[model samples]
Structures are given as structure tokens and as C-alpha cells.
Target: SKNVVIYADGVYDMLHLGHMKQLEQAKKLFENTTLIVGVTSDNETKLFKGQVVQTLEERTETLKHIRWVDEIISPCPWVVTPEFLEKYKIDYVAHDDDIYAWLKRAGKFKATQRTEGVSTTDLIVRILKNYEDY
Candidate 1:
């Protein structure tokens, strides 16, 4: 069977339902899809996103449990290079529509449906609201 490698890279600082849905959708794009989730390191995330709630190791480990994830690329680069796609035999980079413009411009963009009313930010807000519950 021909393998169709789809790359999905993100901070994944806190695993949530949205993340699962995104991966789920990406895997469904092809019959023989190999979904490789690239987990951005804490250092890389902090450079732009500020303070990571979970370490790279933790996120990587958690993502491993996801049934849809075929493989994981740790310390994932912020941007995908041509060489990367070539090396991994990637068909395309799958992401939600709201990602950076450069991704689309680079010609590796494949839009996936973003789950409504759920996001990492929203979860954080909920946690803050009920800080003591945990």
C-alpha cells in the first residue's frame, strides 16, 4: 500500500479535545494516512507563545497515547523546509485555516476543520476560573 504522510506540527502544550479532533481529521484525509505530529519544544514555543504549561517530554509522551498518531517528531521545527518534506516523504502539512500566512504561501498547506468552541486558550481560562478544583 502507498503511504501518505501528513505532517501536523504544533505546540501541544496542553493536550485537549481540539488537538485530538485536528489529528483525527488529518488522518481521515487519506486511505493510508500516516499522521506524524510534530511536537514543538518548550524553548521554541516560549520564543513566541510564552510560558509552556507542559514540557516537551510531557507533551510528546501524552501525544503518544493518541490512537491516530502514527509517529511523533520532537523538537519540531517552527517552519517546514523542503528537505524536511522530502526526508519524511510527506504529502502535505495539515493545519487549521488560521495558521500563519507563510504556510499557505509555501505551498504545503492543507486545510483541516477546526473544532468550534474549543481551544487551548479556552481551556486555560477554565482552569484559571476553577484554580482550586485541581
Candidate 2:
């Protein structure tokens, strides 16, 4: 069986083409691999965004419908869920330094950084407060 490439990363605020591209690429990396896009919690958004754009439940449901995504993990702190990884025998973890570092330090995940264009939260804010209206 093809090894599973466990990819878990993102903050799909608007879930645009860029996010789609990232998922596609991650899927291409390995066969039989599960692409898991770990959403940054709305609470995390509130902390970083100073406001909540989409509720966690909304994001989870949205991802569940995606064809590329195999699973969805709720918004946890920006850290790898070792419990999930170990139990699932996650083959690979696609993530940024913060999450990867936390996992690496804890001996769960290794770093896998893949860039997705634009910031979803920033994009939404820009649209909502579009200066053209002024």
C-alpha cells in the first residue's frame, strides 16, 4: 500500500484557489495519503485577527465536503496533535515551523512547509473594509 502522507495545515478563512492548489499539491505528493487541513480555531483567529470571521463549525463542515481532504481536525492550538498522529500512524505531516517545531520537539512531526498564496483572514478583512466604498 502507498504510504500515507499526512498533510495538516492552514487557516482557510476564505478557502480560495490558493488553498485549493496547496491541497492538490499535497495530495500529489503521495498516493493513499490523507490530506488533513488543520484549521486554525476561531478563537485563534480572534487572538490573531482580533475578530472572528468564520465559526469553527462552519470551517469544519466546509472541509468535510472537500474531495481532496480526507479528514478534518478541529481548531487546536498551533501545535501538532501527537495523540492523533501516533494513533493514526501518520506517515507525513505537512506544516509550518510553529506546528512542526512543536511536533518535532515533542517527537511527533517533522517540518514540511508549503506556501499558499495570500492570507485568507486578511483577504476577507480587505474585502469587508474595501476602501473603494469610502
Candidate 3:
């Protein structure tokens, strides 16, 4: 089987099981694949979503420990352009949301299953509620 390079980009800030499940979904797309996780930078998060809890380096390090991740691209941009796809030789761009609808129209997008109930916000709320135990 030919190797298929799939690109999945995310903040991966809190590093949770949800992130792993998404990566797993991306990997399942092809028999032989390279899963390239693009870890968004803290600076970009601040610009787009305001505050970021973890630094770029911290998020990158945490993701590296995941067995499903084959490679990582730090400081990944919000938009995945054609140049990026060509540059990295990415066969498909996988995302769990309709945020990549434009890319999908361009015929370079792949949909991954979204992991429900497990989210960064939920984790934050849990931490706040159980602060005394920590």
C-alpha cells in the first residue's frame, strides 16, 4: 500500500483523550499513513480565542509522547493553504468540524469523527470543582 500523509491541525492545549481519538480517526483513513499533528501556537490562540493556558513548547512536548502521532508541526497557521499541502506533500487534511468546509470543497479535506463530551472547557471546570483534591 502507498503511504498517505494526512495533516491534522489543532491547539492540543490541554492534551486530552479527545485529541487522541481525533488523531486515531485520522490515522484510520489510510492503511499506510503518516499523521502530522499541527500544534497551534499560544500567540495565535491569544489572537483568535483570547487566553491560552499552555505554551507552544509545552503542548508540543505533550503531543510527542502520543504513540499515534508520527510527526508534529509547531506554530501551525490557522489556515491550511495549497502551498502548505504541496510543501508537506499532504494527501489529505483531516478536521473534525465544518471549520474546514472550504478545504473540503477544494477536494483536499477529510472528515474525522469528533469526540463528544470530552473537551478542554469540561476539564477546566472539573479542575476548578476538585481543586481541593489536587
Candidate 4:
């Protein structure tokens, strides 16, 4: 009876199947698991990203409907800390990228394989390219 809590946080600027698949992976990490998704605040995302296509509220609403998501922590901390983990009861922090340095050192990081090919960043490139090409 191992019930685990997984925390998967991201900017989620634009929703895609790959993102959903990553969330699906977190949801199935354990037989009896709670998948808590963390959506960074607009201000936080802006610091790390160029410009967000949607606001935090819009992203959160979309995340709420995901089948794999059990809970959502909006304005989640961009940098994960031990205290945050304890507060959220998160046993493992899941992410497609290895940006969680502290969690990795603490052996609490759970790496998730990101879906390839289809990407929002790439789409942005295309959007701009066509913007100029058009």
C-alpha cells in the first residue's frame, strides 16, 4: 500500500499532447498516487520565458480539465525547496527537464520523458516565420 504524491510543475504556456502525456506519466507514477500539478505564476514565467501566450488563470482552467491531474497548485514556486515539498506532502518532484537542482541532490527528483517533435516553442517559430513569410 504505497501511496505516493507527485508534484509536476511547469509553465505550460501552450497545451499540447506531449504536455498531457507528461502529466499522464506523473499520474501513473504510483498505483495509489496523487498527481499535483504546479502552474507557475505569470510573473514567475515571464522571468524565465520571453512572453506567455495565456495568463495564469487561463492555463489553470485548462489544466483543471486534464484527466490525469488530481490537483493544481497555481503560482507554484519556480524553485522547489524542501519546505515546499513538506508543505505540499510531495514525495517526488516530477519534471521533463532537470531544472530542479536541489531536488535532484536530495534524491527526490523524478525525471519524466517529454514528448518529442511537437513543441510550442517550435510552433512559435513557425508562427513568426509565417508572419514574416506571409
**Candidate 4: tens digits of C-alpha lDDT, residues 11-71:** 8878888899999998887789999999999997888776888999999999998999999
User: Which residue pairs in model 1 clash with each other?
Assistant: none
Q: Give the backbone clash total of model 3.
A: 0
Q: At residue 54, what lDDT does model 1 achieve?
A: 91
Worst 10 residues of 1 by lDDT: 98-107
**For model 1, how does the per-residue alpha-carbon lDDT over 1-134 read when each residue is reduced to its tens digit?**
67788999998877889889999999888788899999998877999878888999999999999999999999888877778888998887998864446567776678887676687789678878866766
Highest-scoring model, TM-score: 3
- For candidate 4, the lDDT comes to 0.87
Better of 3 and 4 by TM-score: 3
| Reference-based TM-score of each model | 0.81, 0.66, 0.85, 0.84
lDDT of 1: 0.86
In each prediction, how many residue pairs overlap at the backbone (N, C-alpha, C within less than 3 A)? 0, 0, 0, 0
* lDDT by residue for model 2 (1-134), tens: 76675756666765766666667766666657777677878766777666656788887777776788887767744655667676667766765454256666654454444455466656778778856665
Which stretches of model 2 miss by more than 4 angstroms?
Answer: 48-50, 96-134
What local distance difference test score does each model get? 0.86, 0.66, 0.87, 0.87
